[PDB]
């Protein structure tokens, strides 16, 4: 197993961890702010997924400073992970294309 592939799998396991920790900490950060909606865990994990993939419908989002900081970590972890996979697919294609030559 090549490095690019390992970094990818590793990025995916880390993403799943950031999603679960993100869901937990967003609820922790948001309860206490009047009007906040990101306050029960099942919808926070869903919020965490749509943030990490950058879709951002939104239907829910953080209103406090710490929930937002948590949002930024989720965003960056998702963008980095999906980017790592893209780059791993590139390394794979470039390697196999040099063999077809």
């Amino acid at each position, epitope marked *: 197993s090549a490095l690019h592939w390992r970094a990818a799998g590793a990025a995916t396991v880390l993403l799943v961890i950031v999603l679960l920790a993100g869901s*937990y900490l967003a*609820v*922790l950060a*948001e*309860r*206490g*702010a*009047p*009007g*906040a*909606q990101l*306050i*029960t*865990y*099942p919808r926070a994990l869903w919020w965490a997924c749509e943030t990490a993939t950058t879709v951002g419908y939104x239907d829910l989002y953080p209103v406090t400073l710490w929930g937002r900081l948590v949002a930024v970590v989720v965003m960056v972890a998702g963008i980095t992970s999906f980017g790592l996979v893209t780059a791993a697919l590139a390394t794979w294609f470039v390697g196999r294309e040099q063999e077809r030559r």
Partner: antibody, heavy 118, light 108 residues
Framework: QVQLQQPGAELVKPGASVKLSCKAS????????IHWVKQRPGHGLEWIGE????????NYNEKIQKKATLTADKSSSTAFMQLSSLTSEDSAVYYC???????????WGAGTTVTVSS | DILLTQSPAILSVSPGERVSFSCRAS??????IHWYQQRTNGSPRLLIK???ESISGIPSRFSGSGSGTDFTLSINSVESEDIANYYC?????????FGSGTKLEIKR
């Protein structure tokens, strides 16, 4: 078995303070919150505050005057509510309730009847 | 904070009849409404969660409906054991809040 155990009563003199307890059993998770609800005789349910034991953070009802301070004890699985500088207005049944972080109160304590009298 | 209005405060019905308690939220809360029963001297008891979901251990006679700002708790063929106070509670926005309560009364 009873999931939340609370003392049946507490007598407190005006100006004094008391600390109510809520001992929990059954399944316990990192996502549990313990809530406290106040009910005066003949009246409705009034939310006081909440605490997430696994982390120790508490939030309180801003619409009312703060008489409560919540704390939890991980080892003894007990949540505590310290009421301070009480008056007759503070006499009521205080229930603790458990929420699995999904918004509803699955189970309630039997409640502690508090009386503020000389 | 979300204000939950329960009206009427007292509801009188005849045995076996169908009854409906109403809960109106001051703003839209999807289906994040929960219903509780509290008999005289008893502690509250969860009856319906998320507006219409059944709870194990609760007679099938009980059902909930609504979404948005208007919610209903219904009882098919009310009986004596249903005499109590009923509360709705919302979990859509912080802080959680309760409705003021409806009392069920039976005319025998």
């Amino acid at each position: 078995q009873v999931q939340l155990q609370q003392p049946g009563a507490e007598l407190v003199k005006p100006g004094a303070s008391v600390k109510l307890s809520c001992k929990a059993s059954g399944y316990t998770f990192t996502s549990d919150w313990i809530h406290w609800v106040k009910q005066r005789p003949g009246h409705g349910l009034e939310w006081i505050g909440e605490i997430i034991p696994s982390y120790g953070r508490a939030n309180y009802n801003e619409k009312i005057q703060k008489k409560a301070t919540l704390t939890a004890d991980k080892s003894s699985s007990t949540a505590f509510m310290q009421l301070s500088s009480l008056t007759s207005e503070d006499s009521a049944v205080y229930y603790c309730a458990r929420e699995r972080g999904d918004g509803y109160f699955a189970v309630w304590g039997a409640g502690t009847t508090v009386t503020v009298s000389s | 904070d979300i204000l939950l209005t329960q009206s009427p405060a007292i509801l009188s019905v005849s045995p076996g009849e169908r009854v409906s308690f109403s809960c109106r939220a001051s703003q839209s809360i999807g289906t994040d409404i929960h219903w509780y029963q509290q008999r005289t001297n008893g502690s509250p008891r969860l009856l319906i969660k998320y507006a219409s979901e059944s709870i194990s251990g609760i007679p099938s006679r009980f059902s909930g409906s609504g979404s948005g700002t208007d919610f209903t708790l219904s009882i098919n063929s009310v009986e004596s054991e249903d005499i109590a106070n009923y509360y709705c509670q919302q979990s859509n926005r912080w802080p959680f809040t309760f409705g003021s309560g409806t009392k069920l009364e039976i005319k025998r």
